[PDB]
């Protein structure tokens, strides 16, 4: 009887799909989380120089978005005065071509009606600004902090589902591996960049962005012991760089050390969805099923 067949197909639709498969009896809720990150590693740059956590992590106190320096270019002992600007901003020969005002595309200062020597043969437009000017860009290759590949990331996380009042936490040697140590919160940087689909050598010489996700997909009808985190690594490359300066005083004069920092930016996002049996969606689904069953 075709009526019996259509009744059966509608019935199997509701029970087999809405409830068994899509869990129509459940209601989704969000979570609130806190993430803490600790960096373990040392680097040597060549006199010889050593970089500690207080030096290669931005910001110091930590944040969901933080940068780990992998390479840099330093312009030291930079004061404020009159100096020749970069020749890429324009090579001049006579004072007629030096119009006072503002530069563009890399403006290092305010120009002036004067031409001064740059490298004993070319004459560039004189500027007022932070002098001496930032040296022509020559990114070190290989990167200066190439040892960053072996630093470690200890990630602490504590979530809470406000709707169901459920809290969980993600916690003498261990390193994370996808199918060997799946529940080790300590990650090596080279592993994360490889898992994001990125070459750490290139991502160290220019910089890059690596996203980190902690998926707390939990079925609360089960135990809380089975509500575990799942880590996934995302490649969000054109590079990542920023400029920061260390200001100091010598002989009463204020100087600065300009750094152009190439580093890997890590973004940690915690998103999860939990469900629990409710009576409203069950009745809603069965009523819709009865309606379609009849029609």
């Amino acid at each position: 009887v075709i009526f019996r067949l259509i009744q059966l197909v509608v019935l199997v639709y509701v029970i087999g799909w809405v409830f068994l498969y899509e869990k129509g009896y459940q209601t989704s809720s969000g979570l609130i989380s806190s993430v803490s990150v600790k960096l373990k590693g040392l680097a040597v740059t060549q006199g010889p120089q050593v970089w500690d956590v207080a030096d290669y992590v931005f910001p110091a106190q930590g944040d969901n978005s933080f940068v780990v320096m992998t390479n840099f270019i330093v312009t030291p002992k930079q004061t404020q005065g009159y100096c020749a600007e970069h020749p890429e901003g324009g090579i001049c020969k006579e004072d007629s071509g030096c119009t006072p005002g503002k530069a563009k595309r890399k403006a290092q200062g305010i120009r002036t009606g004067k031409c001064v020597a740059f490298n004993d043969t070319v004459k560039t437009c004189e500027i007022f600004g932070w002098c001496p000017v930032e040296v022509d860009d020559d990114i070190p290759r290989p990167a200066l902090l190439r040892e960053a590949e072996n630093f470690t990331l200890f990630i602490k996380n504590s979530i809470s589902f406000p709707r169901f009042k459920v809290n969980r936490r993600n916690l003498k040697t261990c390193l994370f591996h996808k199918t060997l140590h799946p529940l080790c919160p300590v990650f090596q940087l080279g592993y994360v960049v490889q898992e994001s689909g990125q070459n750490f050598s290139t991502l160290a010489e220019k910089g890059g962005v690596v996203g980190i996700t902690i998926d707390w997909h939990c079925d609360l009808d089960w135990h809380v012991r089975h509500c575990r985190p799942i880590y996934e690594f995302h490649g969000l490359s054109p590079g990542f760089n920023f400029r920061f300066a260390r200001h100091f005083v010598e002989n009463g004069t204020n100087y600065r050390h300009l750094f152009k920092v190439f580093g890997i930016r890590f973004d940690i996002l915690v998103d999860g969805k939990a469900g629990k049996f409710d009576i409203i969606p069950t009745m809603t689904t069965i009523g819709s099923g009865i309606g379609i069953f009849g029609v």
Copy 2:
């Protein structure tokens, strides 16, 4: 037949409203995004002083919330010792009125049972703290970094819808305009403050907060080429200021340069809603429609 009329009105309700208008056949999902911001600009303050990106952007590495300084008040060469406090904290004449302990409403240090001169005629309570004390507030008018009006904001954004596994990115001269260049990720600061409904002159002399929103309202039944971002500027004024210090050492003594920074705070929020046809909501809606159709 009134029964036919009510059948028609119920039917037009479901098809015409739930499905055609509110898209009852779709299911909403969230997104995960990463934002990167670059600042292009130079400023001159008067000896003459020049402010670079490493100097007027807080924090250096960048963040979804960042501040661009537009004005400041600097108390230089500030050491730790015994000095007269601000007369606004209380003008004294005799040691009897100087009770050692703690001040209030602007406490510059711990008091002591002594009165010392402040400006050769008034005698204020002696304190231990960072001396000399912060000079009386006189906000510069017009602002010192009044050239901030013409700086530019290059915004990078990359979103991803976890449910439908859809990723999108928002990307020789271009500046954003609302109905001229609607898809240019480079914004001039004075434009954003005007669009937020704010005067940049006042918002530069005191500070302020400007919110930036990137609405990725995308209908995934269409192409991904039509899933574009939409920028909206919000005015979230009492002002925005904060204090930060540059610490240095001279002759073995630690000093600091206290800055009171007035600047514009930019908050970037990425929120969007995407939909895709599903079978659960369609059946739910039609079942409810059959129920109401009959009753």
Copy 3:
């Protein structure tokens, strides 16, 4: 009549539960918020030292996650050179046990094939790094900034519901109390730590994390004057610490002041749910009710 009874029980289910209790006629929406925080307080540490807001708040400009220092350990005048490492890293007696390379678990530098004296009796492995090495950990007890208990937190908040286009803001003496001053945005630190279920003395000597939540549960069918914020304090302890350095130049040599900062981390999360009567959920619920009523 049992049929009348089942009709009555189904009917009371829908009207009494979906609509009256769970507000099935409403539709939930999220919000976008901005938070600003101001710290009022002074501390004295013993020559005598005074800590201002520019010194004990990380970051300076402010952020939803910020740290207020409560205790610290400072290693001053730290240069780069050859020095004996910490004896906890290994006590040696002969050069045979000094293998050049890298240390572990606390690596202070790169070792070398040499043994040098540490405290005139033990000989430790010589390293290159930031010298002199960080002194053995002795956390001050009681904490150095023990006056942090009486600092204040002024919280500004401005929310907006994008769906219903509703904006709200949470705003000569006032301090917050749970059942005395419920709408005072100024919180004392010792109150927040007590409300989180934490001892401020211990949380000051090691550090800790305190979460702050602003629940904007608003029923938009009422007035907006009744859409008020609700503050809740969460205890998210193993402690919280980080390392940061102040770099300075003396006699042409770069030194640094390494700080190990123990402080309380405050996380502010703004989440709320607003509802407004809609026609889609009402019809959906009544259709499901008619379906179940019949079956």
